[PDB]
Design a binder for this molecule. Structure first.
Ligand SMILES: *Cc1c(COP(=O)(O)O)cnc(C)c1O
Ligand SMILES: *Cc1c(COP(=O)(O)O)cnc(C)c1O
Ligand SMILES: CCc1cc(=O)n2nc(C)c(C#N)c2[nH]1
Ligand SMILES: CCc1cc(=O)n2nc(C)c(C#N)c2[nH]1
Ligand SMILES: [Cl-]
Ligand SMILES: [Cl-]
Ligand SMILES: [Cl-]
Lengths: 357, 360
């Protein structure tokens, strides 16, 4: 139905701007402004940019009772020329609309939201840092807001966006706990959408990981222990495959994998190089062990917006530590992926992937 | 530590809501009472509990309750008998379940008997909102949410516990319901969180419930596994009263193996039937193959869901792919259903004193 329009934006500037930072911790520091859009039985209201402020919700809000909530995560980068650019934001907009439809929340126009986000970033561009490795994290959210305890398609909703200046998350490698007792997502489920409900249950599992000397969780699937995701990151393996061919593999989008923007960007980059096989195929612990013993594994890493390419060096599997020679192999592929992404994101090389603010 | 009911502060309302009219029927979960329970937790532990005028919540925009679904809820009923005495039905079990949910989401622990007392005190304040016409009750909705103003996926250092109340009647206008049973839809899985009453389990079902409507059915029969196990009906547990394949008369409901929410009404129906000792009462997996066969052999007496909002819900039809299966629940009395409803009514409205009722 009829989406809100960036033409109808309403600006309300803060009366007292907040003092910028001077070691930015991920997701804790927020900027002066936010986008807010209300939806109800009269359709979408006018978007507005307003000072960062608390939400007022009815205590029966379906957002809080039945997890009618979804989110996105994407980054804006400030180049030398002081120009700010979003990385592949259309893909985030596409994913967000898919999430919306899955939870029966209102459809909106992807380009209208992008423009409202652009404007919001414009208003707050001084918050976008420019130091090496820094960026602005953009967190759009769409939540149901029905004031009723019936499990139902909501007739009210709020779409809002907040911004965080950020540095890194932690090229330092990580250890993973691989315990098949915990299952992140199931074929036929909603693991392939960026819905809040997929994340809350992982908190206890991440604590078990820390208590057991690991930093992230490696989510395994199926009776053949398929490697699916690392924490909130897609997983990649750079090895020589069972048929003697050097390749980059990541599991295919079969339902239990969130289709990451960085994931897709790395598959694209590597395909464009034309220097080795790039494939989407199931990866099992059985295959990984055999390859590790036969010395065919060069690099293992996770990919995601907050930690774009995360080296892995250890997997704790069936109480037995497995060493991953990632850091011993350069890590060349990882360093090469990081360099090209940096050149693109900071505008050193022009690229259609970037959207200027 | 825990908040204490001894520390309760009361703020009475200065804008009381007009209560539901005479010929104005109660719609489930839409009408709220005048007051609410509110308790905050942070690095200092739990603050003091407050009973306060029903009012909006004020949440930071990065609240982890809204980004990563750090949220759980409960649902239980208070019943007013003819002598105007209000009683809660087996609230201890909801308190137990709420605390398990909390631990699963790394949300803060609390004292079950302190929460129960705060809830009793809350209902006492709004006692006149408890209706007393037949089949009516007061639905009680506790909630516990994470409230970390941080975008990292982590254990919150701040939380919020609150409770709101609604006067209710029946969920639907003992008219049986039809169910959509399609194996494409998966509510929960072994190793997941289907056995906890966490907000994240419900949101994904809204779309599936719309497909049930679109295909002419009223609720979703959630199927699991290669063998199409019957797990749950909508937000209710499922029971089958049949003559099994070994020729024995039994009431069966799926076992608590991870994909089943352990209902209070479920447990109570098992307790009641087990206590009668008139037939076999088991927890065992139930498959579509088994149901299909039992229906063609006329061994099925009654099928029904159980849950707080619709305590004993008869089923008359199941649309399994294209096979429209008639369930003969209503032609069989429904004798067991009526018996369960009659006993529950006697216990709930205080006709017959019982250890299951907690007086307010
Ligand atoms: C967000 C996310 C990813 C990666 O997504 P990006 O779009 O690259 O940031 C991968 N797996 C899970 C489970 C995620 O939530
Ligand atoms: C709440 C619930 C039930 C039944 O719980 P009761 O405690 O009897 O009200 C059954 N199934 C699901 C999925 C539920 O959420
Ligand atoms: C989805 C936002 C987010 C939260 C969070 O705690 N993490 N942790 C990591 C390692 C990432 C990434 N990428 C991430 N991303
Ligand atoms: C959990 C509260 C609740 C919401 C809702 O939409 N429903 N629908 C039904 C049939 C029930 C029950 N029991 C129920 N219970
Ligand atoms: Cl997908
Ligand atoms: Cl009890
Ligand atoms: Cl259980």
């Amino acid at each position: 139905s009829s989406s809100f329009k960036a033409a109808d934006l309403q600006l309300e500037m803060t009366q007292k701007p907040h003092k910028k930072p001077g070691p930015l911790v991920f997701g804790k520091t927020f900027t002066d402004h936010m986008l807010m859009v209300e939806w109800n039985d009269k359709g979408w209201g006018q978007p507005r940019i307003q000072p960062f402020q608390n939400l007022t919700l009815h205590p029966a809000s379906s957002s809080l009772h039945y997890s009618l909530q979804l989110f996105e995560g994407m980054k804006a980068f400030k180049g030398k020329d002081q120009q700010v650019r979003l990385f592949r934001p259309w893909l985030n907009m596409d994913r967000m609309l898919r999430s919306a439809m899955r939870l029966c929340l209102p459809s909106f126009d992807k380009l209208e939201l992008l423009e409202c986000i652009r404007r919001l970033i414009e208003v707050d561009k001084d918050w976008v840092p420019d130091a090496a490795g820094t960026s602005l994290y953009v967190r759009p959210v769409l939540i149901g807001n029905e004031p009723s305890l019936g499990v139902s398609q909501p007739t009210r909703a709020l779409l809002f966006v907040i911004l965080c200046p950020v540095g890194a998350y932690f090229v330092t490698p990580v250890s993973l706990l691989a315990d098949p007792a915990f299952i992140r997502a199931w074929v036929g489920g909603v693991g392939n959408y960026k819905l809040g409900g997929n994340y809350g249950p992982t908190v206890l599992v991440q604590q078990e990981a820390l208590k057991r000397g690991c930093e992230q969780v490696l989510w395994l699937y199926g009776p053949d222990h398929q490697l699916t995701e690392v924490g909130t990151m897609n997983i990649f393996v750079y090895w020589t495959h069972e048929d003697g061919v050097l390749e980059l593999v990541t599991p295919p989008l079969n339902g239990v994998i969130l289709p990451g923007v960085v994931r897709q960007s790395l598959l694209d980059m590597a395909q464009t190089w034309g220097e080795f096989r790039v494939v989407e195929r199931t990866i099992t612990m059985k295959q990984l062990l055999r390859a590790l013993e036969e010395g065919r594994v060069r690099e293992v890493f996770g990919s995601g917006t907050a930690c774009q390419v995360c080296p892995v060096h250890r997997i704790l599997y069936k109480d037995r530590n497995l060493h991953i020679p990632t850091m011993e192999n350069g890590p060349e592929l990882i360093l090469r992926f990081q360099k090209e992404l940096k050149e693109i994101q900071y505008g050193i090389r022009a690229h259609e992937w970037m959207f200027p603010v």
